Amino acid sequence: EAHAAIDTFTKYLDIDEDFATVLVEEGFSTLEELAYVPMKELLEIEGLDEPTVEALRERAKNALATIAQAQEESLG
């Protein structure tokens, strides 16, 4: 559910739902897209700040690192 993408980012990206939605709203429901997408590309999404987008991505990868920990428990 898209609603889960809002809390997920808030759980990993450490952001608020109103902000996460902007990432999932643009088309980023997976931390990989947020972390895989570069700062500029992510900062261009609209009017994000250099640091806010720079720190948001850092969390994406850092969060994905943990997600990979649970991924090992499941085949997917």
UniProtKB/Swiss-Prot annotation:
It is found in: Cytoplasm. Sequence repeats lie at residues 14-64. Signal peptide: none annotated. Belongs to the NusA family. Monomer. Binds directly to the core enzyme of the DNA-dependent RNA polymerase and to nascent RNA. Participates in both transcription termination and antitermination. This is Transcription termination/antitermination protein NusA. It comes from Shigella flexneri. The gene is nusA.
